[PDB]
Symmetry: C4
Subunit: 461 residues, 4 copies
């Protein structure tokens, strides 16, 4: 009865986990442990999110306060990736001297627990560095002159730094001016929970940048904040965030072992049935377990990166957040496997499998037209439209137009000063919107719907 | 002929109310009284809306005028949930002293019928309360020091309060400063209808809040207005809004009794027919009457809450407005029952009943993907996007993206300073929009349309 | 052969106008004359539009210049239906005195061909009128005190009007202050075409309005411009716009006579065929000619109103523009009749006729839900959302939401200060969007498409 | 066996290029050379785009700096096509004198490598030209008075030009005032790549324009920048962009010869088969090759225009960019031909061919309604809505409304001051949106989908 054994095993392989508890009466660990994964991974993600939100909020608020304190005539919103700009030789001098003078008077201007930090040389002071082209008769070599203005020099009642030869900034040869200083802060919004609060160090840099030499000096403010140790503080669990992460690793490591077992054992079952079929005369490979394995790997990597982040007091979580969020997404998506055996919960996945070939084939022809339109729009409307300035911006604009978004602003944001470009823009926009939206969206939704219809008629036969 | 009786009663149960006037020639109270409900409930809602609009408008305009009078350099729009903000120790002093000095000179600055009210202690004056951390060497206990500045102290020509030790606000230990005062107003826009006008009392509080200790002091203005009695006024129907509400209660109470009778009597008819069916060999439960009962209950509760609100002169109608509006919505929706027997007016409800199982089953699988995307987007794009800052904001953004709204702003509002987060954002957004919109919306509309098609072919057979 | 005659006439009645030129070889006046109508009506509309655009542009630019000249601290954009606002008793005095002083110095401030006009009393001067409640101890009777400030009084070097008792404006009793004056302008942008240019008279009124008595005085500027005769001008065809209008009237009057003939003669043909059908054993009423008759009537009324407007030099064209535009719309729509006989150009009208019953029946049930949602949203979200402030605004917002517009701004523009209203808003918005968009739009498009399918299968059989 | 030869040739004509390598074993030049075209044309377009982006960026930044330097009280954003505006006779004088005085002090105000250029007369100076109506008693002849203010006149310490009779600008007769000057710049952002940098000359013109005579003087700033030769510069490949363009011309010229050969030879094959068919008893014309020929012609013209642009140092690329972008679009679109023989990659083109007749016929009837609505909306809502101001703006707004864009802003941007126009606007907007979106989009998508269905059933039979 080896054929009996083989066919009974094949019957066991395809029955629902509920039915696998009737065929052989065994506990479904790969379902309870997966529910545990969902719960624990979601809790970990939410708690990580809340904590890093607090840290990011503190850093951003301090940066905004720094910009108000040190940038002259700062509205409150950044003009661009740069914060301020100046167009006159006297406005630039005013901005530079304002920054230096506001540094000099920090203790009487700041509304927070700020102080004077220390550079690598361990001195409380300010560094100003200018870059010029060496000398109409200019060379390509950049001269770099730096000065270190200490608080005792700045404090001098008849100040001398203002009349020094360093601050005579020939502007036709000037590339940039940098002001760098260090500040120490204390997060007092944590002390309400009995603890030693977090101490920060801010590496603040102000760049007055005219690399373009086009009349505008762009002013950049960058603050790099790191958590240091509170060396001067007297206020009259990391352990329990490292054991919860260890638990998540344990659950995910177990799920990797169970799922890898199934994938290996499923392949052996296919071998046993293929050999018989050749003797007498994909439904074996489960891609959901391939998804679970990737989820587990990403969760383990994210938990390890998060433990490393907390252990050495880091403040950059972009990679760890990406791993944790993608793992949580994949966990919630893999929940669908435990509703897919159900007789009326699988229309979506079946339709996706049906569609995928036809959908991919369709997107090839539409992709070529989309790429041609992207290149044409970037080359023609790029100088005259801000939704067509960069190739990725053109792609995003075209995708949104296919989804019918900002169609009137896109039409109306082109100026009629050039009539040729305006006419071309009208022709371009009406040809893409018409062609793409109507024809291509019709034929794409129609393919999906006919795949869904084919899936439902098999279900009904 | 007991079977004759039973089958005649079953014929009576399913015929249209117009036909029930031919089978047994009886008045359809449950239709005329329902039309009366529609008319009267809509009139009540509209009149309530107009009156509470007038009251809310007065209160909001007074609040805006208060903000202009007392907040220094107030643009006219709130920055956030807070009204103003300051970043310098001298700006905060200027704001505080400006508020106190503008209170001192209210009679010569206000453009309205304002006056000086009285606190619980029954004295015309101003209260300033500061909160500090008790003392670098700070404790967790918050010291609370308050002063009461009366108009006679403020009026003193060489004022002394400005140089007092209370207003030396150490800012590294400061949590918040509160200014509280009372003002009395008169609504003169009502006197044009011969009456004694409405007298208001405003509990105004200004909070200079730096609980974050991040360099910015947020300034909150809150005005709590209550209607008092006009004790000093000589200007040379509540009854008819309490009898109209009583009429609405009477009509709704009658409708509850009639509809509860039907539901009970319908169950008895089912018993009489089930017993026979077992002898010889839901269409009895009406969910529209279950909706009418809830409508009547909500209308009665709303009318009682509104009568209570007017009787003790309250100015908060959120709960009463919710009850009245939901009752009106349900009344207009239950109007459809009296068009559902019609042979060609019922396609919508029949399609809803057909779809509901399949639609609910479909939304289970799509819901898991939606939740995973919500968590992933909040954890990754939350620090760098304002449409992903909170989990409910992520949900709203994703729902709007499924409906194709603000797709280019969502794509373009992420800064390319971090290239990893930017690339992940692009992948995330294109995967959700593509997957969800195209596949899921196709399969959802297709299910609804096939349910509609099945409903129409039964109608045609 | 009376039956031969009748059936030949019935054959003649339904053949295309091209075929009517073969059956009986007669000129199709009702086609050439209709093409003439299209051309001439469109030319008339375009020319009217251009001329009234010029006039409106002049008037609006003068109004904007008046607002800048006379409104103190005018940004350039109106805050609301009012232009400016003030919150202090000194700001209102400053605004009033600024308006009067800028009137006094008009000849040295204006950048145009402006001058001092004359009131009904024929005096160059300024009128200031204040309204107070007659006198805490205020009455309901409004006292109206007016003063007339002539340029000779204003010109006096030690002015006296500023210290007069008229400008002591008790603000707790004040309703409004009005400043009225007359200015004369000349449109010099017309003189470049040899003519006597257009002379205007501006009735300017500035209202400082505090009818609400809520602390804000709203400032309204209204300028009423009329074209007068140039009595003082020496610059070193109405006939041909009144004969073109007469031609349009003639063409439209002829079309009314021809189309009324057909409608009458068509009814006689129906009588002759109905009588025979009863003897032996709508396709007669043409609704396109009913549309042509309305088009002709509206065109004649619009042309007469436009001739009247030009004849007495009026500057309000809202009614005439409405008539002309609707007539042009209906003319272009009635062009479709002369493509409807074509065998493959009539799918749209046939589908509309098929759908209309079912579409109307469907919109009845959806209309009740829409009205209930409108009332609920206005009553609940009205105080807290500006897209739900008025009932028509609620209707517009709901219609746009059904069309998927501004869904994220609608979700996010509700403040979470009230949690009950916020939760209700979320439930409300997700229930309408879901229900209406998905189910109702599906069932509406499906009805239209099935009507189109039924129309095409008859065409194919 | 001439029939054998003919039928073998006809078999050869329709087999895929891969199969043409089996039938006769020949190299497919028209595929490899087309891939070369794709690669080389895309590289040329991208490189052209990057270079012209750099040039345009420099010119725009210099223009923005010029506006800040010379326009008094310049916010930073243009109000309209004009930059600034003034409403007072003293504001215009201030602006004019500010422009002249900022020109006088350019060397101490500019943040860049700017200098004083020279006019055609070869003198460093400023030209001011005013236009007046010759003289209430004004004539139609425009007097033109000009002055030339040289730096030596401007430099005079007790300046005299300010009190000259030229700057007494009677404003009721004034048409415009022009200030023209020349500046020389150097692009130093190029020197970092060892080269002689680019030298520019700016023809700057400031027009204070009151042609409307409506109280506002519009201020226009226009800067015309051309690349001159660096005559005064000592900084201590065009060849390789002209050989890459020549290569692109060579590849495109070869593709024209090959494709023209096929089109001619295909016609001969049709003749040989038509003659036989008549003896015994479009699939010959390839429109893809007609597209390739146009692509090649446009690419050659664009490359020649770009070589001409670089050869004489031009800075206008609108025509060349249009040619290059359209050629690249058409190249990427013609890539689809080499996926069209594939058995499941041609659904899109087949559906387009099927649909096109029906789609064109449908758009005729919808076009008439669209044109009527456009005219009606422009004539009625034009004075009161900025999305209906011009006929093309009306068309764009209506197209976006059909695509469901900005529906609430369109509804809400009409003011209720005129109730007739407001009611008409509501009726107009709800009738177009309803009719067009629902009915017309349904019938258009339905036609496309039924064409797709007919194409798929032939494929399956
Ligand atoms: C641990 O046990 P656990 O992994 O939780 O349970 C296994 C799974 O149910 C597996 O089915 P899938 O869920 O589809 O992988 C099944 O084939 C195995 O049967 P078998 O032991 O006879 O091979 C079980 O051992
Ligand atoms: C009060 O009378 P009222 O409630 O207005 O009228 C009743 C309803 O018409 C009910 O039908 P529904 O409208 O479907 O509930 C019907 O079964 C009852 O017949 P019956 O009296 O023989 O039981 C009527 O008495
Ligand atoms: C003027 O002549 P006109 O109105 O231009 O032409 C008439 C129309 O063609 C009419 O058909 P419709 O276009 O459908 O109204 C037709 O029935 C009449 O035939 P009849 O004269 O024998 O009655 C014609 O006289
Ligand atoms: C150069 O040769 P080339 O143009 O690259 O190749 C030609 C094409 O393959 C052409 O088919 P299409 O691609 O459809 O035009 C085919 O008819 C010609 O066969 P023939 O030479 O026997 O006429 C070939 O010579």
């Amino acid at each position: 009865m080896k054929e009996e054994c083989l066919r009974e095993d094949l019957k066991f392989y395809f029955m629902s986990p509920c039915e696998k508890y009737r065929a052989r009466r065994q506990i479904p660990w790969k379902l309870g442990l997966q529910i545990l994964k969902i719960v624990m991974v979601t809790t970990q993600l939410v708690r990580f999110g809340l904590s890093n939100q607090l840290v990011v909020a503190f850093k951003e608020d301090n940066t905004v306060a720094f910009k108000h304190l040190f940038l002259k005539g700062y509205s409150g919103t950044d003009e661009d990736d740069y914060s301020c700009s100046v167009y006159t030789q006297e406005d630039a001098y005013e901005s530079i001297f304002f920054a230096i003078n506001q540094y000099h008077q920090l203790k009487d201007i700041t509304l927070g627990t700020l102080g004077y930090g220390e550079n690598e040389d361990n001195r409380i002071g300010l560094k100003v560095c200018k870059q010029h082209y060496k000398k109409l008769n200019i060379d390509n070599d950049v001269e770099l002159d730096c000065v270190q203005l200490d608080l005792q020099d700045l404090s001098k009642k008849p100040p001398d730094w203002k009349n020094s030869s360093f601050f005579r900034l020939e502007f036709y040869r000037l590339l940039q001016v940098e002001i760098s200083f260090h500040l120490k802060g204390i997060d007092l919004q944590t002390i309400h929970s009995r603890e030693l609060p977090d101490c920060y160090v801010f590496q603040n840099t102000i760049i007055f940048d005219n690399k373009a030499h086009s009349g505008k000096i762009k002013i950049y403010f960058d603050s790099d904040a790191k958590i240091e140790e509170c060396k001067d503080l007297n206020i009259f669990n990391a352990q329990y965030v490292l054991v919860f992460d260890a638990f998540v690793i344990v659950i995910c490591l177990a799920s990797l072992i169970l799922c890898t077992r199934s994938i290996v054992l499923a392949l052996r079952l296919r071998k046993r049935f293929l050999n018989f079929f050749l003797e007498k005369y994909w439904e074996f490979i489960n891609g959901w377990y391939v998804l679970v394995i990737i989820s587990d790997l990403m969760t383990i990597i994210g938990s390890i990166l998060k433990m490393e982040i907390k252990a050495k007091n880091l403040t950059n979580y972009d990679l760890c957040s990406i791993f944790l969020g993608t793992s949580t997404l994949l966990v919630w998506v893999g929940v669908i496997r435990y509703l897919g055996y159900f007789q009326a919960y699988n229309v979506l996945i079946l339709t996706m499998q049906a569609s995928l070939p036809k959908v991919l084939r369709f997107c090839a022809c539409a992709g070529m037209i989309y790429l041609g339109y992207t290149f044409c729009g970037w080359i023609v409307l790029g100088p005259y439209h801000d939704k067509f300035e960069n190739l990725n911006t053109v792609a995003e604009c075209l995708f949104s137009l296919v989804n019918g978004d900002d169609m009137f602003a896109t039409f109306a944001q082109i100026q009629q000063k050039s009539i040729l470009v305006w006419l071309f823009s009208r022709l371009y926009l009406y040809s893409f919107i018409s062609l793409f939206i109507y024809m291509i969206l019709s034929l794409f939704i129609a393919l999906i719907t006919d795949s869904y219809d084919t899936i439902k008629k098999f279900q009904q036969n």
